Amino acid sequence: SGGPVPVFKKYTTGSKGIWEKIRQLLTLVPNRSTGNPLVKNYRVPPPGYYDRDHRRNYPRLVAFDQTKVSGLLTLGSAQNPRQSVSLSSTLATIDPKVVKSELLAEGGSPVVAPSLNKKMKFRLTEESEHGMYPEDYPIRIFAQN
Amino acid sequence: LLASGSIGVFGTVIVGWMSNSKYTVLATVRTTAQLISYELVLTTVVFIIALIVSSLNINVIIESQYNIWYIIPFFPLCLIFFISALAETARPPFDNVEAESELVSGHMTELSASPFVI
Amino acid sequence: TNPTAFAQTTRYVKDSTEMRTLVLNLYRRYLRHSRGFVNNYNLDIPASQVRTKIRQEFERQRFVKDLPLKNVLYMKAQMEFQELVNFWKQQCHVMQYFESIKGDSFVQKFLKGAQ
Amino acid sequence: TDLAKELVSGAPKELITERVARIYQETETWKIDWDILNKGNRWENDLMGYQSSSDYMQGTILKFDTREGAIRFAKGQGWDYYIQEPKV
Amino acid sequence: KSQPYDAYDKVDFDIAVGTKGDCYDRYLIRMTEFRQSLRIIEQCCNQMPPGPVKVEDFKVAPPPRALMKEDMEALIHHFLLYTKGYAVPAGETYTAIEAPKGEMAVYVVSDGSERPYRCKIRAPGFAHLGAFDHIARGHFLPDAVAIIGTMDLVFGEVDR
Amino acid sequence: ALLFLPFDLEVSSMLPYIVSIYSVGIYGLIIFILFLLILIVGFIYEFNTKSLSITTILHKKNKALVKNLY
Amino acid sequence: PTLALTSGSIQGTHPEGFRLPRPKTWEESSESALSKATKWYLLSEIFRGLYITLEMYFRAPYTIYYPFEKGPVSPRFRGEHALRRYPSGEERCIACKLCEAVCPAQAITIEAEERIDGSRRTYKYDIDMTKCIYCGYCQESCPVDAIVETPNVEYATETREELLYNKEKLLANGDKWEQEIQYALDADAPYR
Amino acid sequence: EEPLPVLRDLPRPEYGELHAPVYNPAEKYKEQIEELHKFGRYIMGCLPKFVQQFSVWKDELVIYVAPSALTQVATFLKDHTSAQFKACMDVTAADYPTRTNRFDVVYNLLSVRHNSRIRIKTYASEVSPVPSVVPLFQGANWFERETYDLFGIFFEGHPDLRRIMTDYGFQGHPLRKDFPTTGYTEVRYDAEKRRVVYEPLELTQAWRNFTVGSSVWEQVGDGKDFTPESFKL
Amino acid sequence: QAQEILIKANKGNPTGLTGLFQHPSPRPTLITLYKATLKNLEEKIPKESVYRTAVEAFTKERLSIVENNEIIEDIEKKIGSGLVEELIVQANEEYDLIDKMAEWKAWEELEEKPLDDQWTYFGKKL
Amino acid sequence: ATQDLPPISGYAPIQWKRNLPSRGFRPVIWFLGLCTATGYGFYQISLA
């Protein structure tokens, strides 16, 4: 948790002597550093086959047109079995009980657009948690819950 | 002192006048409407000080502050004077005369060499 | 959103006759702004010269035949009108637009290098 | 095929007339490229030996799929061309 | 969050949402993006795992120089990587990431060749500048600067 | 700009009272306050009508969408 | 079970308390009228803003004094292209044309032939430093570390012609910067 | 009042043998491929007349329609509450000269509500117009102008279509395959004319073509199928 | 019959999302517009059109859930498609589509058939 | 050992939440000071 941190826990140039106590009396926030890095620590020493293959097994490119689309409702599926063959005529003459299981899900209810990530669930947070602006500021903070 | 301030105000509005119209004449109705308005507030502040000493002589005004400095009684006026002092000179934050991000160099975009120095 | 000055919707015209009348008005629009093009771009050629060049431009390609290619030629010529009238092309491009431009015998081309 | 599409492609006048495009086959697909210029295709720069050029179509090659597809394109643009039949 | 990628699911951070849709709100969101980004940097430093830094497939990555000059298989892939390049299997893709400006995405078509066929780049600054007319209408000339600034325009990205 | 001319003549006409604030005594002070209260009504009038505001009427108009079922 | 029955999702579910509360009116402000007026009239936040700026006036500036001092550099720094050389004196480069192929900006021009001794070397090797992007594929492509980028950056020239580096100019730098390139390589050996 | 540590002197773990897992990334899309196939079938169910075909690559869904059927499908994909694709992120194109309709106009849509993206792909020729999606999305006003400028595609119904990426008075549409990468002309300054003038192209060094030593062999094959068994014959 | 249904208000309390004011009397107005949707299907869209079946699959489902719940919060939570103000928008713009979809006759056969080579990418059939 | 890895304990937490504590006396005190400064000032002017 990123609470306030004293000056002597930040790798920066500090104050030595009575000037430290002068600084802590004049500066508005005594736990802020000057920002100059620590010369004594910061950058002190300078910098001086098939089992493991997947590209060849990339998912294939298969296109589903009106001809093949009609075949799933009539013949069924390759898991649960049941030229130009137009779909529009098939929808005009076919059993709605085929529709309520194949062409639709959960009793004809329309299929909500598939989420790119299901677990994107948000919750509204509060000031004492995220340490951000108080309530009057015109933003709100969301989290992943 | 106040009269000579007015002449410089009229001196500035000449800068953005008739020298084509790209950026100087954009900041001349803007300029004139600024250092006109604050010249009211600056003038009133001066007179209120002169009212306290009943004199229009700067030496009398200076010599009459022996036992008190008008920063103590007239602290609001000093802020108001300085705010008006900034705006009259067109210094920032009241610096839309030469609005660098808006009017390139403001009214001095045409000026170069000696006209700029003066 | 607010469209700019001298804008027209891009429409696929499905008539031979309507395109004829659209072009005719367009040619007048160029001639109406003949004085402006001289004063806007500070062209060295007088107003009559620009109309002469505009006429040479319009006379040049009046014999096209394909309607699907008629709309494309009307669409882009509209852009040329819109770019020029709105004063968008720089001064140099208009000066060089009118500053562009008989062959030589085989001996002349043989000697220097031909192409 | 009958369309004068050259007035919409914006290509210079020299492509229609003074340039020749070869439709060849290097082993399953066909390609189009323009034959080299008579002079000025490649002259040695006298400063650093760079291979200078005035031909702007030297670096252009179009990968096609079928022969008739390439011929359709060449007629569509109004391009002069010839076809090189590969040896069997 | 919508499409996690590159060890963003592992870390935790809070997104910021405004309420008024003006420049001051977008400022607060951008300032919050400072601290939330600094929050992840602590997590990335702490949670750093060991191991390799690139895929150990010589066909899509150069082999180490200690091994290029020792192993005949290593030198061949070094020679082949830098002259012909690796070939991308055919397909098409549109991957969008949270760029600092916004949604930046590339549309890439692979023609089975070592060179991409089509590379369209979605620049977040491109679309925002289009909405300048909708946003700036009715404001004053000084407000034009404020609107441009809050759009975070970088015209190298706009005119890609 | 036009309203600067009145208010500037008001301020610049208070000069006589500055150098004579003593001798005129209370009588001048009561006259001086009246000379302002008359000009305050001018100040009050411009305050109410919002004459100084630049105003934004040419744009920033919105409406509520309403279904018109038939 | 999901909300597909109602054509909704758990995604479409806004969090509890998503909707805004009622906005305050003038009677619901914590700071009294006098308290707000004093902050407003006396410029409380501006004066605080001034003080914090004055804090930085008593801090050490970050400025360094070029050219008397330089900023830090790393052993991986990509600067002036340079052609290296063996200790025995023979050129490291054997004219792959790996150089001419990788170069994204096509700034490398190589022409080679059999030397007199027969060992494969190149007689032309030109870099158009005005065309180069200092990408770094020079250094990575070499199987003999013949072309490397020195940590130098101060070589600006009056005439652009001086920015076309032929072989001799590249070889001159390779000798002139050899000891420095030793610092760079021997400090970056483990990570390659 | 305590001294700061030195991080270089902190104790560190020692790591030896590495076991980096090597498994097909396509496994994490096993459900994603399954979800999207139904949704495309659903759209074809709701639009038998317009949805010619569709295909799903990993977590991406593509809808192919004719130019006539473009605005109709995009309106359905915007308003229909099952698929609320309110934002049109990208309007792109590409050139494939072999086919009669060489161009391939793309439409990437974003659904903030349902958290998904779709791709409407409608072909276009050098002369066949495409209806503008401005009446649905005003955000394509600048994405279409880029497509017209770089391809010449004629967009039907654009409120104002013109050049947005090329120079004023530029000739030709660059992103075509027949357009040379170096262009036809380049500019310079001519002192006598006292202006910057266009001139025919001249290269001191021509663009060397290194594609000649390309691959002559096959690189990638069919691959491994991952189609969910519910979408097979 | 001359009626007026309030789609979105132009004043009042904000609803988090900018430019989306709080609807004064949403719950019956949602019920009215939801009911008017089912009337529009019965007049324009044929029976076999799966778009018609897909509208009722959630219009009846949601509209029934709205009536039982008398708290505005509970209407959103169980339907799970955002705020109440947004739920008005979803119902309204879906109503217009029923008018437009019937005009298009999108229940018919494929109007324009693609050519042979159109949907093949780089020679290999998709 | 032969790489860059964070320490076993990691590092101490960093400060990242907003930390802007206020300063100065309450506005009433500043207001009261302004009155006294005026109240004392007009006593000195009046004496003069």
Ligand SMILES: CCCCCCCCCCCC(=O)OC[C@H](COP(=O)(O)OCC[N+](C)(C)C)OC(=O)CCCCCCCCCCC
């Ligand atoms: C009796 C008491 C006497 C006090 C005399 C002094 C008064 C001064 C002005 C107070 C009112 C004011 O600064 O107002 C602020 C005004 C107008 O703000 P507004 O339009 O009302 O918006 C605020 C709406 N609120 C009420 C909801 C918050 O704009 C400004 O930000 C002006 C900024 C001026 C900066 C000048 C810097 C100069 C620094 C000088 C020292 C280094």
Ligand SMILES: CCCCCCCCCCCC(=O)OC[C@H](COP(=O)(O)OCC[N+](C)(C)C)OC(=O)CCCCCCCCCCC
């Ligand atoms: C001799 C004086 C000269 C200057 C006169 C004007 C000063 C400004 C204060 C008047 C307005 C007011 O009332 O400010 C009040 C405000 C806000 O306080 P709050 O939010 O209620 O505090 C919260 C709750 N506490 C009280 C528990 C903390 O305080 C300030 O932030 C004061 C700013 C600090 C520095 C000011 C001086 C910096 C300039 C350098 C001069 C030394």
Ligand code: SF4
């Ligand atoms: S550094 Fe890169 S771009 Fe520059 S010359 Fe070398 S390979 Fe080419």
Ligand code: SF4
């Ligand atoms: S990679 Fe090295 S050896 Fe090969 S051509 Fe380049 S510099 Fe010469």
